[PDB]
Here is the input.
Amino acid sequence: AQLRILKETELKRVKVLGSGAFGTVYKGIWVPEGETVKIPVAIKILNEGPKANVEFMDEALIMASMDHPHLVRLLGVCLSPTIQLVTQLMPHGCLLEYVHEHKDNIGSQLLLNWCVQIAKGMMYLEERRLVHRDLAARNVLVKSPNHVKITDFGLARLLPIKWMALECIHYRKFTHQSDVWSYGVTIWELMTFGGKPYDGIPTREIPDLLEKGERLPQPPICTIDVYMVMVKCWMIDADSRPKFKELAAEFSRMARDPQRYLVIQGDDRMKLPSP
Here is the structure.
Protein backbone atom coordinates (compact mmCIF):
# COMPACT_ATOMS: atom_id res chain seq x y z
CA ALA A 1 0.00 0.00 0.00
CA GLN A 2 2.22 2.76 -1.39
CA LEU A 3 1.68 6.51 -0.79
CA ARG A 4 3.61 9.12 -2.78
CA ILE A 5 5.14 12.06 -1.03
CA LEU A 6 5.38 14.93 -3.54
CA LYS A 7 7.73 17.95 -3.45
CA GLU A 8 6.17 21.47 -3.17
CA THR A 9 7.65 22.38 -6.57
CA GLU A 10 7.04 19.03 -8.24
CA LEU A 11 3.57 20.58 -7.96
CA LYS A 12 2.41 23.66 -9.91
CA ARG A 13 -1.08 25.18 -9.70
CA VAL A 14 -3.01 26.54 -12.68
CA LYS A 15 -6.46 27.64 -11.49
CA VAL A 16 -9.16 27.18 -8.82
CA LEU A 17 -12.08 24.85 -9.67
CA GLY A 18 -13.90 25.19 -6.35
CA SER A 19 -13.52 25.76 -2.60
CA GLY A 20 -15.76 23.99 -0.05
CA ALA A 21 -16.03 23.66 3.76
CA PHE A 22 -12.76 21.79 4.16
CA GLY A 23 -10.26 23.23 1.62
CA THR A 24 -9.77 24.36 -2.01
CA VAL A 25 -9.45 22.33 -5.20
CA TYR A 26 -6.92 23.44 -7.78
CA LYS A 27 -6.42 22.15 -11.31
CA GLY A 28 -2.74 21.33 -11.32
CA ILE A 29 0.27 19.78 -13.03
CA TRP A 30 2.75 17.30 -11.68
CA VAL A 31 6.29 16.78 -12.85
CA PRO A 32 7.98 13.69 -11.31
CA GLU A 33 11.78 13.72 -11.23
CA GLY A 34 13.37 14.68 -14.56
CA GLU A 35 11.52 16.77 -17.21
CA THR A 36 9.63 14.03 -19.05
CA VAL A 37 6.05 13.74 -17.84
CA LYS A 38 3.35 16.24 -16.87
CA ILE A 39 0.05 15.14 -15.34
CA PRO A 40 -3.03 16.88 -15.21
CA VAL A 41 -3.65 16.45 -11.48
CA ALA A 42 -6.13 17.68 -8.88
CA ILE A 43 -4.85 19.38 -5.73
CA LYS A 44 -6.58 19.63 -2.37
CA ILE A 45 -5.11 22.06 0.16
CA LEU A 46 -6.85 21.87 3.56
CA ASN A 47 -7.03 25.14 5.44
CA GLU A 48 -7.35 25.51 9.26
CA GLY A 49 -5.13 20.63 11.72
CA PRO A 50 -4.44 18.24 10.08
CA LYS A 51 -0.67 18.46 10.55
CA ALA A 52 2.17 16.13 9.41
CA ASN A 53 1.64 13.47 12.05
CA VAL A 54 2.15 9.81 12.13
CA GLU A 55 -1.60 9.91 12.89
CA PHE A 56 -1.96 11.79 9.64
CA MET A 57 0.33 9.44 7.72
CA ASP A 58 -1.68 6.49 8.99
CA GLU A 59 -5.00 7.73 7.64
CA ALA A 60 -3.43 8.81 4.34
CA LEU A 61 -2.08 5.33 3.86
CA ILE A 62 -5.46 3.81 4.42
CA MET A 63 -6.85 6.22 1.83
CA ALA A 64 -4.05 5.43 -0.58
CA SER A 65 -5.09 1.83 -0.09
CA MET A 66 -8.65 2.62 -1.17
CA ASP A 67 -9.01 1.06 -4.59
CA HIS A 68 -12.02 0.71 -6.88
CA PRO A 69 -13.63 0.72 -10.09
CA HIS A 70 -15.70 3.68 -8.92
CA LEU A 71 -13.50 5.15 -6.19
CA VAL A 72 -11.02 7.99 -6.54
CA ARG A 73 -7.58 6.89 -5.62
CA LEU A 74 -5.40 9.33 -3.77
CA LEU A 75 -2.22 9.61 -5.81
CA GLY A 76 0.04 11.62 -3.58
CA VAL A 77 0.43 13.99 -0.66
CA CYS A 78 2.48 17.14 -0.25
CA LEU A 79 3.13 18.72 3.13
CA SER A 80 5.28 21.74 2.42
CA PRO A 81 3.14 24.85 2.69
CA THR A 82 0.45 22.70 4.29
CA ILE A 83 -1.37 19.40 3.61
CA GLN A 84 -2.20 18.63 -0.01
CA LEU A 85 -4.04 15.61 -1.46
CA VAL A 86 -3.24 14.83 -5.03
CA THR A 87 -5.76 13.17 -7.28
CA GLN A 88 -5.84 12.27 -10.99
CA LEU A 89 -7.70 15.10 -12.70
CA MET A 90 -11.20 14.29 -13.79
CA PRO A 91 -11.68 16.26 -17.01
CA HIS A 92 -15.46 16.09 -17.03
CA GLY A 93 -15.58 17.19 -13.37
CA CYS A 94 -18.36 16.33 -10.90
CA LEU A 95 -21.49 14.38 -11.78
CA LEU A 96 -23.78 16.95 -10.15
CA GLU A 97 -22.65 19.58 -12.59
CA TYR A 98 -22.59 16.94 -15.36
CA VAL A 99 -26.29 15.95 -15.31
CA HIS A 100 -27.31 19.58 -15.45
CA GLU A 101 -25.11 20.52 -18.44
CA HIS A 102 -26.15 17.57 -20.53
CA LYS A 103 -29.69 17.32 -19.18
CA ASP A 104 -31.01 16.73 -22.71
CA ASN A 105 -28.47 14.12 -23.95
CA ILE A 106 -28.51 11.73 -20.97
CA GLY A 107 -30.58 8.58 -21.61
CA SER A 108 -32.05 6.16 -19.06
CA GLN A 109 -29.16 3.71 -19.41
CA LEU A 110 -26.48 6.01 -17.98
CA LEU A 111 -28.76 7.13 -15.20
CA LEU A 112 -29.35 3.69 -13.75
CA ASN A 113 -25.75 2.73 -14.59
CA TRP A 114 -24.42 5.56 -12.43
CA CYS A 115 -26.67 4.21 -9.68
CA VAL A 116 -25.06 0.78 -9.79
CA GLN A 117 -21.57 2.29 -9.92
CA ILE A 118 -21.92 4.45 -6.88
CA ALA A 119 -23.58 1.51 -5.24
CA LYS A 120 -20.57 -0.72 -5.88
CA GLY A 121 -18.38 2.26 -5.00
CA MET A 122 -19.87 2.15 -1.53
CA MET A 123 -19.93 -1.61 -1.21
CA TYR A 124 -16.13 -1.43 -1.10
CA LEU A 125 -16.02 1.31 1.47
CA GLU A 126 -18.50 -0.72 3.47
CA GLU A 127 -16.38 -3.87 3.03
CA ARG A 128 -13.42 -1.90 4.30
CA ARG A 129 -15.38 -0.39 7.11
CA LEU A 130 -14.95 3.13 5.97
CA VAL A 131 -17.90 5.44 6.36
CA HIS A 132 -17.98 8.22 3.80
CA ARG A 133 -20.31 10.52 5.79
CA ASP A 134 -20.79 12.95 2.87
CA LEU A 135 -22.22 11.27 -0.22
CA ALA A 136 -23.86 13.70 -2.69
CA ALA A 137 -23.88 14.27 -6.45
CA ARG A 138 -20.98 16.68 -6.01
CA ASN A 139 -18.57 14.19 -4.54
CA VAL A 140 -19.14 11.72 -7.31
CA LEU A 141 -16.88 12.50 -10.27
CA VAL A 142 -17.13 11.67 -13.94
CA LYS A 143 -14.14 9.89 -15.50
CA SER A 144 -16.10 9.17 -18.67
CA PRO A 145 -19.80 9.31 -19.64
CA ASN A 146 -20.27 5.65 -18.55
CA HIS A 147 -17.74 5.81 -15.69
CA VAL A 148 -18.10 7.66 -12.47
CA LYS A 149 -15.98 7.54 -9.31
CA ILE A 150 -16.63 8.63 -5.75
CA THR A 151 -14.27 11.03 -3.96
CA ASP A 152 -13.93 12.71 -0.58
CA PHE A 153 -14.41 9.45 1.35
CA GLY A 154 -13.29 9.58 4.99
CA LEU A 155 -12.29 13.23 4.74
CA ALA A 156 -13.48 13.80 8.30
CA ARG A 157 -10.96 11.27 9.64
CA LEU A 158 -8.54 13.97 8.56
CA LEU A 159 -10.99 16.73 9.54
CA PRO A 160 -24.39 18.78 4.55
CA ILE A 161 -27.70 18.61 6.42
CA LYS A 162 -29.91 18.00 3.43
CA TRP A 163 -27.97 14.77 2.76
CA MET A 164 -27.76 13.76 6.41
CA ALA A 165 -29.75 10.88 7.89
CA LEU A 166 -31.86 11.93 10.86
CA GLU A 167 -29.73 10.16 13.45
CA CYS A 168 -26.66 12.11 12.32
CA ILE A 169 -28.44 15.39 12.69
CA HIS A 170 -29.38 14.65 16.34
CA TYR A 171 -26.80 12.17 17.53
CA ARG A 172 -24.01 12.52 14.95
CA LYS A 173 -24.07 8.73 14.71
CA PHE A 174 -22.18 8.02 11.48
CA THR A 175 -22.76 4.55 10.01
CA HIS A 176 -22.75 2.77 6.65
CA GLN A 177 -26.54 2.80 6.98
CA SER A 178 -26.39 6.59 7.39
CA ASP A 179 -24.50 6.75 4.13
CA VAL A 180 -27.31 4.69 2.59
CA TRP A 181 -29.53 7.69 3.33
CA SER A 182 -27.03 9.88 1.50
CA TYR A 183 -27.10 7.63 -1.54
CA GLY A 184 -30.87 7.93 -1.64
CA VAL A 185 -30.47 11.68 -2.01
CA THR A 186 -27.58 11.41 -4.43
CA ILE A 187 -29.54 9.34 -6.88
CA TRP A 188 -32.53 11.62 -6.39
CA GLU A 189 -30.12 14.39 -7.41
CA LEU A 190 -29.55 12.53 -10.65
CA MET A 191 -33.13 11.73 -11.53
CA THR A 192 -34.04 15.42 -11.29
CA PHE A 193 -30.88 16.21 -13.37
CA GLY A 194 -29.23 18.22 -10.55
CA GLY A 195 -32.25 19.46 -8.60
CA LYS A 196 -31.68 21.09 -5.24
CA PRO A 197 -32.87 18.93 -2.29
CA TYR A 198 -35.52 20.58 -0.11
CA ASP A 199 -35.48 23.64 -2.34
CA GLY A 200 -36.67 26.99 -0.96
CA ILE A 201 -36.65 25.44 2.55
CA PRO A 202 -34.37 26.55 5.40
CA THR A 203 -31.86 24.30 7.21
CA ARG A 204 -33.20 24.26 10.75
CA GLU A 205 -36.65 23.04 9.62
CA ILE A 206 -35.37 19.96 7.86
CA PRO A 207 -35.39 17.63 10.97
CA ASP A 208 -38.98 18.19 12.11
CA LEU A 209 -40.11 18.02 8.46
CA LEU A 210 -38.52 14.62 8.09
CA GLU A 211 -39.94 13.35 11.43
CA LYS A 212 -43.40 14.21 10.03
CA GLY A 213 -43.01 11.62 7.25
CA GLU A 214 -42.42 14.15 4.47
CA ARG A 215 -39.57 13.14 2.17
CA LEU A 216 -38.17 14.36 -1.14
CA PRO A 217 -40.77 14.30 -3.92
CA GLN A 218 -41.14 11.93 -6.92
CA PRO A 219 -38.84 12.88 -9.81
CA PRO A 220 -40.55 13.47 -13.19
CA ILE A 221 -38.71 10.61 -14.98
CA CYS A 222 -39.29 8.03 -12.20
CA THR A 223 -41.53 5.00 -12.13
CA ILE A 224 -42.93 4.40 -8.70
CA ASP A 225 -40.66 1.32 -8.54
CA VAL A 226 -37.37 3.27 -8.38
CA TYR A 227 -38.98 5.83 -6.20
CA MET A 228 -39.86 3.13 -3.67
CA VAL A 229 -36.21 2.25 -3.59
CA MET A 230 -35.36 5.82 -2.67
CA VAL A 231 -38.09 5.99 -0.05
CA LYS A 232 -36.62 2.93 1.63
CA CYS A 233 -33.30 4.75 1.94
CA TRP A 234 -34.96 7.45 4.04
CA MET A 235 -36.40 5.03 6.57
CA ILE A 236 -36.34 6.45 10.07
CA ASP A 237 -34.99 3.13 11.36
CA ALA A 238 -31.41 2.57 10.12
CA ASP A 239 -31.41 -1.24 9.95
CA SER A 240 -34.70 -1.18 8.01
CA ARG A 241 -32.96 0.67 5.14
CA PRO A 242 -31.26 -1.32 2.30
CA LYS A 243 -27.57 -2.55 2.26
CA PHE A 244 -25.38 -1.44 -0.62
CA LYS A 245 -25.31 -5.01 -1.90
CA GLU A 246 -29.05 -4.93 -2.43
CA LEU A 247 -29.19 -1.50 -4.00
CA ALA A 248 -26.56 -2.63 -6.46
CA ALA A 249 -28.36 -5.85 -7.35
CA GLU A 250 -31.55 -3.89 -7.85
CA PHE A 251 -30.29 -1.07 -10.03
CA SER A 252 -28.23 -3.73 -11.88
CA ARG A 253 -31.39 -5.72 -12.49
CA MET A 254 -32.97 -2.53 -13.89
CA ALA A 255 -30.10 -1.68 -16.30
CA ARG A 256 -31.12 -4.71 -18.37
CA ASP A 257 -34.37 -3.00 -19.39
CA PRO A 258 -33.60 0.69 -18.83
CA GLN A 259 -36.63 2.58 -20.08
CA ARG A 260 -38.77 0.03 -18.21
CA TYR A 261 -38.01 1.96 -15.04
CA LEU A 262 -37.23 5.55 -16.11
CA VAL A 263 -39.26 7.47 -18.66
CA ILE A 264 -37.67 10.29 -20.57
CA GLN A 265 -39.60 12.42 -23.06
CA GLY A 266 -38.51 14.66 -25.93
CA ASP A 267 -37.85 13.04 -29.36
CA ASP A 268 -41.31 14.24 -30.48
CA ARG A 269 -43.00 11.02 -29.10
CA MET A 270 -44.77 10.18 -25.87
CA LYS A 271 -43.45 7.01 -24.34
CA LEU A 272 -46.23 5.24 -22.43
CA PRO A 273 -46.00 2.81 -19.45
CA SER A 274 -48.14 -0.04 -17.99
CA PRO A 275 -48.52 -2.68 -16.03
